[PDB]
């Protein structure tokens, strides 16, 4: 919604497209909403000033087209044998639907396209992809009740999402691998409930909504730029980066509360072994977050000296500072929240 009146439209039609999917009482109706959503995102994603952006507009299109195509294939097949939108006892035909939806959201085994399209997106584009585009796919998976297929994606998601991220330096590509891990937590939270998932998703989007602005406001795209980034008060820069820890889910900060409620419910449901692989793998995710904090926690750096000044947008920064404040002090407000009980 940044340049012209047209961008305003595509954003809204994206909202309508997603809503049609998650409010549809049949597979066919759901599939239509995905098509509406598809063309709402591409024009927002394609810009010809960048040779990279058009490539991003491609990989997404080929992947999503295939996903919706295979998704419709199975849905027709599903009700060719059952004659209902629902299958009484889950079987292979329902697995195929799950496979498409995971690819639609870039879960582990079919995530490859997802980081590899993040090179050529603006930060505001990545947020729309990382947060909103994952609503419709993941929300339909709540209908399907296959365990092992869903379970396998979680185990691979946290692993591939973490180990892959260690080697990156591009923040846009790094966040993609970071997002794959948080995706793993959702699917784990999705085999147990949705209200946790709805809660967990809202917090995940919140943190990503924050980190995207900080890069977007100061146009940072590489790790080196963090060290070269100039800030008046190294205390201020030190505190802004304390959002990564919340994204790492450390308990003193707000970003752990989401992880916390997903464990109090997974454990309640006896999924002990899963949590071991997940929570253990989150450490590796917590690692490269600290590699970013190298530019803040140490707090006297060798920096280029042709800048004395910070030039920043007010409204984005004004909303970013408010969001950051809760991201550090949001824990004591758990008392207020009444959606977990």
């Amino acid at each position: 919604m940044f340049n012209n009146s047209s961008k305003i439209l595509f954003i809204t039609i994206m909202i309508i497209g997603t809503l049609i999917t998650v409010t549809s009482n049949s597979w066919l109706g759901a599939w239509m909403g995905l098509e509406i959503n598809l063309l709402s995102f591409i024009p927002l994603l394609s810009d010809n000033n960048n040779l990279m952006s058009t490539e991003a507009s491609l990989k997404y299109f080929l992947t999503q087209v295939l996903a919706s195509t295979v998704l419709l294939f199975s849905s027709i097949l599903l009700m060719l044998k059952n004659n209902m939108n629902n299958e009484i006892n889950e079987s292979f035909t329902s697995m195929i639907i799950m496979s498409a939806l995971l690819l639609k959201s870039g879960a582990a085994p079919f995530h490859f396209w997802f980081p590899n399209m993040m090179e050529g997106l603006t930060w505001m584009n990545a947020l729309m992809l990382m947060t909103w585009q994952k609503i419709a796919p993941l929300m339909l998976i709540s209908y399907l009740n296959i365990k092992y297929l869903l379970l396998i994606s979680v185990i691979l998601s946290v692993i591939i999402g973490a180990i892959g991220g260690l080697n990156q330096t591009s923040l846009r590509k790094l966040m993609a691998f970071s997002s794959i891990n948080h995706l793993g937590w959702m699917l784990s939270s999705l085999m147990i409930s949705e209200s946790i998932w709805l809660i967990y998703f809202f917090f995940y989007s919140f943190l990503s909504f924050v980190l995207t602005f900080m890069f977007n406001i100061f146009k940072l795209f590489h790790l080196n730029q963090l060290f070269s980034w100039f800030v008046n008060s190294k205390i201020l820069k030190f505190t802004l980066f304390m959002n990564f820890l919340s994204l790492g889910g450390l308990p003193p900060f707000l970003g752990f509360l989401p992880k916390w409620l997903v464990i109090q419910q997974l454990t309640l449901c006896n999924q002990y072994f899963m949590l071991t692989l997940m929570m253990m793998s989150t450490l590796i995710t917590l690692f490269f977050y600290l590699r970013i904090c190298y530019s803040a926690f140490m707090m006297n750096y060798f920096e280029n000296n042709w800048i004395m000044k910070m030039n920043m947008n007010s409204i984005n920064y004004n909303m970013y500072m408010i969001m950051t404040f809760f991201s550090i002090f949001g824990l004591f407000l758990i008392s207020l929240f009444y959606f977990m009980f």
Partner: protein
């Protein structure tokens, strides 16, 4: 089995559609060519199922409308491809 005598042929055709959509051809248009091939087969099955209903074939129009838009959108992205890379070859894109 019923599914083998009546629904096997379209499904076997569908997977052959996908294997076109993934095979290595130089030009991006080879993907678009195989794209509406698959759509043609999706219509065929969907038309089997809709006819198990006595009067529900009207939904064929709904499906066709989305078929052209993905093809039409698929063709627009190709146009935007040309005016940044100059050509549509797959091997011309950065491998990442």
């Amino acid at each position: 089995m019923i599914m083998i005598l009546y629904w096997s042929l379209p499904m076997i055709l569908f997977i052959l559609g996908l294997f076109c959509f993934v095979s290595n051809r130089k030009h991006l248009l080879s993907m678009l060519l195989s794209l509406e091939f698959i759509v043609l087969m999706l219509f065929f099955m969907l038309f089997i199922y809709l006819n198990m209903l006595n009067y529900e074939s009207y939904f064929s129009m709904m499906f066709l409308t989305f078929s052209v838009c993905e093809g039409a959108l698929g063709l627009s992205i190709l146009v935007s491809m040309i005016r940044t890379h100059g050509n549509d070859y797959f091997q011309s894109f950065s491998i990442m």
